[PDB]
Design a protein around this ligand. Structure first.
Ligand SMILES: Nc1ncnc2c1ncn2[C@@H]1O[C@H](COP(=O)(O)OP(=O)(O)O)[C@@H](O)[C@H]1O
Ligand SMILES: [Mg+2]
Lengths: 50, 37, 468
């Protein structure tokens, strides 16, 4: 599901893909945007964040 | 949601010129930075 | 859904686009240069898909002032130029903007400048003579109405003067439409042609498209396509005879070679792009007459360094029905037009089309000139007195013939002060038949230099102390 939404949302994929920005900030952005939602598997969220 | 994503990315963007000579020689220099040059 | 500039190097610009928004090849994109002095809108033609959503494009305008990461907009279509009867009597640039009346033609129908050539089944050989009034051209290199004509030559041998002469002789009394394409040539020449056509009243029937040698390589690559698009509209839609003038078509190839190495292509022989023949073939095969729709195209082909073996003119030679090759040697001998009678050729110079008399006279002239060329070195070293009597006679005849092939042209007055002249084809054939028989051997060779017909020859001979 996350791969499909990322594929259909190029802007978030581009922002997260860049490695120049701090990693912690990018993980926080992913959490507050995509993987911090209530109905998300914890293990999948952790894997995606890593 | 497809909407909170936009808010999150906007907050990220709102959260965030002098280059540096990375090499030189023979009257030619290579400079990092200066994104708006 | 817009791209952004990533890399800039001369006229080549790399642009990154989002997924599924990569513009198609040859699409026109727009970018902004906001620097006050150089502020403008760059038009970039997509040249390559580099992968990873990157595209390499050629800038149509200088990239000075362009900044990495600026927005790039995709128009969804190739460069398109206005078409219709409205383009006649106006000057345009490669992008279709009207130079002499900015904003003019914006509401016309617009045609993409990239187009496939006519289908092979629609092609029809053309074998009708186009009389010009120039002795050498009419006799040895007869032009074809509806065919492809070229003027080959090195720098400063008279290609442009002859182009203007043919505009004077052919376009002045032409029923149909004329299209002139200035391709990578001097802006001063473009202004001079514009004023001359306005004064001659031919401008109202002519569409001028200028991309000058000061323009970036992309404009010099695409201006020929723009002018050819206008000519193609006139041929296919309006269904009227079209005169097409290109000067200089070699600049298209030169600009292609200029951008080739920056596009990542490994160079071919003599520093040319590997795709020289293919691009030239596309462009030239678009320039043609189809069945019932006539385009008489005249092209000036620059020969680099006078080297006719250079790959550009060598590849161009295959695309012409008639070629008039100008020689530096003839030029330096003071013979104008500096046509090389032995190197030039025409496909309609055979007895079936031009008739037995014309063909025989032309072949005799060529034979005499070839023999004289063979004997020139012997004459230079050992002198004429060591030649056989028949060879002395042939040498005198050949010198007179080569002088008589020269002619005072209408467009040459500005350089000599002598008004031009026109010679009918019948008079030319008769005069050269007489010359090849030695009927004028008693006249001095100077009497044959830069004149028209036999009446001019008689008058000049009388002025020089001899009677024709
Ligand atoms: N028929 C002619 N009579 C006298 N001079 C000529 C003639 N044709 C060309 N010239 C001279 O040669 C020069 C080169 O002509 P032009 O065609 O403008 O250059 P290019 O051959 O490079 O196109 C002219 O500027 C002119 O001075
Ligand atoms: Mg010229």
């Amino acid at each position: 599901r996350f791969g499909r939404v990322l594929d259909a949302e190029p802007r978030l994929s581009a922002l997260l893909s860049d490695y120049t920005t701090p990693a912690e900030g990018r993980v926080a952005l992913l959490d507050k945007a995509l993987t911090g939602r209530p109905g998300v598997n914890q293990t999948a969220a952790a894997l995606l964040s890593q | 949601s497809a909407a909170d994503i936009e808010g999150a990315i906007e907050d990220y963007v709102s959260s965030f010129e002098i280059g540096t000579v990375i090499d030189a020689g023979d009257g030619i220099a290579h400079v990092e930075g200066l994104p708006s040059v | 859904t817009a791209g952004r500039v990533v890399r800039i190097t001369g006229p080549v610009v790399d642009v990154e686009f989002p997924r599924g928004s990569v513009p198609e090849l040859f699409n026109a994109l727009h970018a902004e240069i906001t620097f006050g002095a150089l502020a403008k809108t760059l038009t970039l033609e997509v040249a390559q898909h580099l992968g990873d959503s990157l595209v390499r494009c050629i800038s149509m305008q200088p990239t000075d002032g362009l900044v990495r990461g600026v927005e790039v907009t995709d128009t969804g279509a190739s460069i398109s130029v206005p078409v219709g009867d409205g383009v006649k009597g106006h000057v345009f640039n490669a992008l279709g903007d009207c130079l002499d009346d900015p904003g003019y033609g914006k509401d016309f129908e617009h045609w993409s400048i990239h187009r496939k050539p006519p289908a092979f089944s629609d092609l029809e050989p053309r074998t009708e003579m186009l009389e010009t009034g120039l002795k050498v051209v009419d006799l040895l290199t007869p032009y074809v109405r509806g065919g492809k004509i070229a003027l080959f030559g090195g720098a400063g041998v008279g290609k442009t003067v002859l182009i203007q002469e043919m505009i004077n002789r052919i376009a002045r009394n032409f029923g149909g439409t004329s299209v002139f394409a200035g391709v990578g040539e001097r802006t001063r020449e473009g202004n001079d042609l514009w004023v001359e056509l306005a004064d001659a009243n031919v401008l109202k029937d002519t569409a001028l498209v200028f991309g000058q040698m000061d323009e970036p390589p992309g404009t010099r690559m695409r201006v020929a396509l723009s002018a050819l698009t206008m000519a193609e509209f006139f041929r296919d839609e309006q269904g009227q005879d079209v005169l097409l003038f290109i000067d200089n078509i070699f600049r298209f190839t030169q600009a292609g070679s200029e951008v080739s190495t920056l596009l990542g292509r490994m160079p071919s022989a003599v520093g040319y792009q590997p795709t020289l023949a293919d691009e030239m073939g596309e462009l030239q095969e678009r320039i043609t007459s189809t069945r019932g729709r006539s385009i008489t195209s005249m092209q000036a082909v620059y020969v680099p360094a006078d080297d006719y073996t250079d790959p550009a003119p060598a590849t161009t030679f295959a695309h012409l029905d008639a070629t008039t090759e100008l020689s530096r040697a003839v030029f330096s001998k003071g013979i104008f037009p500096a046509v090389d009678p032995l190197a030039s050729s025409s496909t309609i110079l055979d007895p079936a089309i031009v008739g037995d008399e014309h063909y025989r006279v032309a072949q005799e002239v060529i034979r005499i000139l070839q023999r004289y060329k063979d004997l020139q070195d012997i004459i230079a070293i050992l002198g004429i007195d060591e030649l056989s009597e028949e060879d002395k006679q042939l040498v005198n005849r050949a010198r007179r013939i080569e002088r008589f092939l020269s002619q005072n042209m209408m467009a040459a007055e500005q350089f000599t002060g002598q008004p031009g002249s026109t010679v009918p084809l019948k008079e030319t054939i008769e005069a050269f038949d007489k010359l090849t028989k030695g009927e004028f051997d008693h006249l001095p060779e100077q009497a044959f230099f830069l004149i028209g017909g036999l009446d001019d020859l008689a008058k000049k001979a009388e002025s020089l102390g001899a009677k024709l």
